[PDB]
Structures are given as C-alpha cells and as structure tokens.
Amino acid sequence: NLPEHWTDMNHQLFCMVQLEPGQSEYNTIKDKFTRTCSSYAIEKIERIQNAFLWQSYQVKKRQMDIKNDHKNNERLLFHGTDADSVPYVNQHGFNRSCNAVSYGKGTYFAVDASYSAKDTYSKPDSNGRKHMYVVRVLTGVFTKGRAGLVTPPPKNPHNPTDLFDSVTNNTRSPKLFVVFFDNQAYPEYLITFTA
Amino acid sequence: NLPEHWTDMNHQLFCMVQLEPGQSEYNTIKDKFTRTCSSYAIEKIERIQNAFLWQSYQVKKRQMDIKNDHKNNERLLFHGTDADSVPYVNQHGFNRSCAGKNAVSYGKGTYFAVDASYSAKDTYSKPDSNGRKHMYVVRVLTGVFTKGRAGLVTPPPKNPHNPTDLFDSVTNNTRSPKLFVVFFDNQAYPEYLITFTA
Numbered sequence: 001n002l003p004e005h006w007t008d009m010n011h012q013l014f015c016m017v018q019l020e021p022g023q024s025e026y027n028t029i030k031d032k033f034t035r036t037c038s039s040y041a042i043e044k045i046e047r048i049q050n051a052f053l054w055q056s057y058q059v060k061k062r063q064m065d066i067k068n069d070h071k072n073n074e075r076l077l078f079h080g081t082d083a084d085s086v087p088y089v090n091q092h093g094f095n096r097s098c099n100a101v102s103y104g105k106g107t108y109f110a111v112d113a114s115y116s117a118k119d120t121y122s123k124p125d126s127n128g129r130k131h132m133y134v135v136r137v138l139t140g141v142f143t144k145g146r147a148g149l150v151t152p153p154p155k156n157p158h159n160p161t162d163l164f165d166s167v168t169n170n171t172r173s174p175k176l177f178v179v180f181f182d183n184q185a186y187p188e189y190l191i192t193f194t195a
Numbered sequence: 196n197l198p199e200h201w202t203d204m205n206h207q208l209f210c211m212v213q214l215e216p217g218q219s220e221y222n223t224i225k226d227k228f229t230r231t232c233s234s235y236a237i238e239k240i241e242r243i244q245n246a247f248l249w250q251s252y253q254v255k256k257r258q259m260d261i262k263n264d265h266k267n268n269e270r271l272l273f274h275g276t277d278a279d280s281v282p283y284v285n286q287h288g289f290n291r292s293c294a295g296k297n298a299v300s301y302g303k304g305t306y307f308a309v310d311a312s313y314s315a316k317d318t319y320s321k322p323d324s325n326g327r328k329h330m331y332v333v334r335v336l337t338g339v340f341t342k343g344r345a346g347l348v349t350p351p352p353k354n355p356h357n358p359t360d361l362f363d364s365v366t367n368n369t370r371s372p373k374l375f376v377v378f379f380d381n382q383a384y385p386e387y388l389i390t391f392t393a
C-alpha cells in the first residue's frame with residue numbers, strides 16, 4: 001500500500017528520488033529545515049522510497065494506534081549522520097546497535113534541524129557536505145529518559161511489560177526523542193546541505 | 196492474518212495456550228525436545244499467541260521470501276532463558292540489546308540453537324527457585340547465512356564492495372550449523388514455551 005506521492009519504481013522496491021525545487025513537496029520539507037537552519041545551504045532533498053521499511057513501519061504504526069487507542073503517535077523529527085552511514089540508513093533504517101547515550105541506548109532524533117546540524121551528528125565530508133534525515137518517528141506515549149535504558153520504562157512498575165513508546169529529555173518541552181526498536185522510525189527525506 | 200487454529204482471544208492481543216499431551220501439536224514439540232534432552236521431563240508446553248509479534252514477523256518473512264526468491268528462510272530453533280525474561284519475551288520477543296555474550300561468540304545478537312540440549316544448559320535455561328527451566332521453540336528467519344565473527348553487530352555483507360546487501364543471519368559452521376544469531380527485531384517469533392525439570 002505505497003503512498004500516493006511516491007513516484008513509480010518500475011516494479012522495484014527501493015529508490016532515492018531527488019525532489020524538484022519549488023514544488024509543494026520540496027517547499028514543505030525545505031521549510032521544516034529552514035525554520036531553524038536558514039543560514040545553511042541546501043544542495044538537494046531526496047525522497048526515500050523503501051517499500052519494505054515503509055511496510056514494517058506502517059505495521060508498527062497500526063499496532064501503536066490500537067494499543068494507545070488514538071492516532072497522534074507520530075512526529076516528524078531530524079537525524080544528522082555521517083556520509084558513511086547514509087547507504088545503510090536508506091536501505092535498513094535506524095539501528096540502535098550502530099556520541100553520548102545520556103537518555104538511553106536507542107536511536108536519537110531532534111525536534112529542531114539546528115540540533116541535528118551540529119558537526120558531531122551531520123559530520124561534514126571532505127567537501128563540507130552534511131547529511132540530515134527528516135524522519136517519521138512513532139514517539140507514542142513518552143516519558144523522561146535516563147542513562148543506560150535499553151527499552152523505555154514501564155508506564156507502571158505493577159505491569160513491567162506495558163512500556164512507554166519512547167523517551168525524551170523533557171516531557172513538557174521535548175527537544176529529542178529516543179526509540180529502542182527497529183521499524184519505529186521511517187527515514188522519509190535526506191537533506192544534503194552545507195554550513 | 197492470525198492463524199485459524201489459534202484459540203479465539205475475544206479481541207485480546209495476547210494469550211498463552213496450554214497444549215494437551217497426545218495432540219500432534221504437543222507431541223511434535225516433545226519429540227523435537229526429547230531427541231537431545233531425554234534426561235529432562237516436560238512440565239507443560241504453551242502455544243504463544245502474540246498478535247503483534249506475529250504480524251511483524253510475518254511481514255519480515257514475506258520480505259525475506261521475496262528478496263531471496265525462495266521459501267527456505269525459516270527454521271524452528273530453541274532458545275533457553277531465565278524465568279525473569281519470560282514475561283518480556285512472551286510480550287515483546289527477542290531483544291538483542293538484552294542478550295548475553297555467548298561462551299563462543301559469533302556476533303552480538305540473539306542466539307538460537309538447533310539442538311534443545313544446547314538451550315537446556317543451566318547457563319541459558321537457568322533453573323528458577325522451583326527448579327523449573329524454560330525454553331522457547333522459535334520460528335527464526337535464518338535466510339542466507341555465513342559463519343559469524345565476535346565483532347558483528349549486524350550480519351556481514353555478502354560482497355565487500357556492496358556493504359549494505361547483507362546475509363540474513365550467521366552461524367557457527369555453514370556445513371554443520373548448530374547455532375544461529377539474528378541481529379534485527381521481529382526476525383524470530385516465540386511460538387512455544389516449554390517448562391521442564393530434571
């Protein structure tokens with residue numbers, strides 16, 4: 001059940017599609033980035049069309065929507081990474097098994113592109129090129145994280161297996177989320193940019 | 196997509212179903228166990244009906260069947276664990292982040308045994324305070340595999356010049372596999388829980 005805005009893949013299951021500047025989709029994603037990174041330079045934005053990763057993500061979204069008895073389990077967040085990780089993320093998504101892990105041993109996502117834009121995350125390559133994903137994240141019901149978590153905490157220590165979906169640095173005003181399971185994040189766009 | 200011979204869970208998402216000796220379903224599991232663990236005695240065998248784990252696993256299986264262009268991707272393997280881990284595995288499956296270092300490490304993942312005797316070691320199926328030992332019977336997407344190495348945190352690439360095209364799992368020995376290691380969530384479905392004693 002592939003999304004209407006994807007473009008045809010001639011019966012293949014993975015494509016990176018460069019967006020056309022000035023069309024609605026490019027403009028929307030560029031605006032999310034420019035909200036906090038207006039001083040950067042965008043080289044290109046690519047849509048990630050990974051049928052398998054999308055399928056697995058959408059199954060987990062449907063499950064989280066049933067469990068939590070609402071929609072509103074998804075957020076659009078940012079993830080800076082090095083050029084050497086991009087091929088893996090495009091094909092396989094985010095892997096906690098692959099910086100500080102102060103809020104747990106998961107994959108980190110920022111609310112603001114400006115945070116992911118730090119060189120510690122979006123490491124510049126030999127030509128100054130930096131890479132950041134725009135990511136659909138199943139944040140669900142979240143709690144404050146802490147060092148050394150391998151999964152989110154339970155919602156009640158009386159039922160130890162009924163977990164929070166994600167953790168954050170601050171529940172009232174989150175700036176980062178950590179997820180601990182495969183297929184809780186779908187890399188939707190890749191932004192290539194410079195300082 | 197839930198299997199039609201599961202018990203009706205009346206809108207619930209999770210159930211453990213105690214099997215009856217003399218049913219083919221119980222006897223096939225008992226035989227598979229006793230082939231290498233005839234010195235132990237089974238207390239009970241429970242079918243694990245976990246709707247969400249099943250759905251996610253079956254998606255991964257269909258994907259691996261498409262990618263590998265054959266349906267030889269699934270093996271039925273054993274996993275011994277401690278009583279404290281059973282509630283988590285029953286609900287959430289096998290988490291590599293929680294896995295012990297194996298005494299012979301072929302990678303940092305979740306380990307599954309071909310022989311129940313391996314999983315029956317007290318190091319894995321730690322006896323609880325009542326002397327009960329716990330072993331899962333697991334559908335595992337082993338797919339295409341190679342010999343592992345202790346440093347792996349994912350399966351290795353098939354081709355070093357295409358680092359993202361991975362083996363599905365690793366083993367101790369490709370000619371005579373006795374263990375498999377998987378490195379991704381929802382690559383293993385806990386199907387039965389065997390409770391057993393000396």
Ligand SMILES: COc1cc(OCC2CCCCC2)ccc1C(N)=O
Pocket residue numbers: 078079080081099100101102103108109110115116117121122176
């Ligand atoms: C590991 O990568 C990140 C980590 C992020 O917070 C990690 C820090 C935040 C402050 C407190 C200690 C942990 C945010 C974004 C990314 C990212 N790749 O964009």
